[PDB]
Amino acid sequence: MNIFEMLRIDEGLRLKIYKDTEGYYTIGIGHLLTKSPSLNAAKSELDKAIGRNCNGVITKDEAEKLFNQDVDAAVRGILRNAKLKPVYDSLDAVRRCAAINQVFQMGETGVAGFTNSLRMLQQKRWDEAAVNLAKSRWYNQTPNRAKRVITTFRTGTWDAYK
Numbered sequence: 001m002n003i004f005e006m007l008r009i010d011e012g013l014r015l016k017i018y019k020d021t022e023g024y025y026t027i028g029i030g031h032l033l034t035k036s037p038s039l040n041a042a043k044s045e046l047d048k049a050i051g052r053n054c055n056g057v058i059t060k061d062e063a064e065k066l067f068n069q070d071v072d073a074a075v076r077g078i079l080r081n082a083k084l085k086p087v088y089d090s091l092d093a094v095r096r097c098a099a100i101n102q103v104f105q106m107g108e109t110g111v112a113g114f115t116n117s118l119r120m121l122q123q124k125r126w127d128e129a130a131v132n133l134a135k136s137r138w139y140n141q142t143p144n145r146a147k148r149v150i151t152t153f154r155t156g157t158w159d160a161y162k
């Protein structure tokens with residue numbers, strides 16, 4: 001198991017514009033195109049990202065390319081964040097994959113108000129952090145996924161992903 005497999009499992013793969021759990025236009029492996037309600041804006045954004053007139057559809061290789069760039073960006077986002085970096089670098093390898101997953105999903109922004117859980121993770125109070133993390137809109141909106149990431153942080157193992 002590695003970050004790619006893990007997120008591939010959490011985001012799935014779709015080659016045609018779709019709406020995500022929040023109703024926004026996305027494609028591929030959880031690649032958010034726009035928050036706007038205009039399909040045309042989403043298609044324009046898609047073409048800009050791929051470099052060609054896609055007409056709302058991409059190939060698997062294209063999807064995989066967007067994915068690579070998005071994982072990259074997520075980690076880089078973390079390392080560049082003064083509040084995130086120290087936490088991230090205190091964790092082991094599996095738990096670092098759970099931090100990337102959360103960032104991939106919610107953004108560095110979303111994750112920065114998890115201040116209290118961040119502190120518990122840094123202190124390595126696993127069970128405490130797990131309870132704290134569940135107390136969030138994130139867990140109430142996407143419980144099945146949130147449960148998998150939470151277990152991941154609680155246990156430091158890939159059990160939740162089998």
Ligand SMILES: Nc1ccccc1F
Nearest residue numbers: 084087088099111121
């Ligand atoms: N949850 C989390 C997210 C990003 C960096 C570190 C973390 F602990």
Ligand SMILES: [Cl-]
Nearest residue numbers: 048049050069
């Ligand atoms: Cl791109």
Ligand SMILES: [Cl-]
Nearest residue numbers: 142143144145
């Ligand atoms: Cl879910």
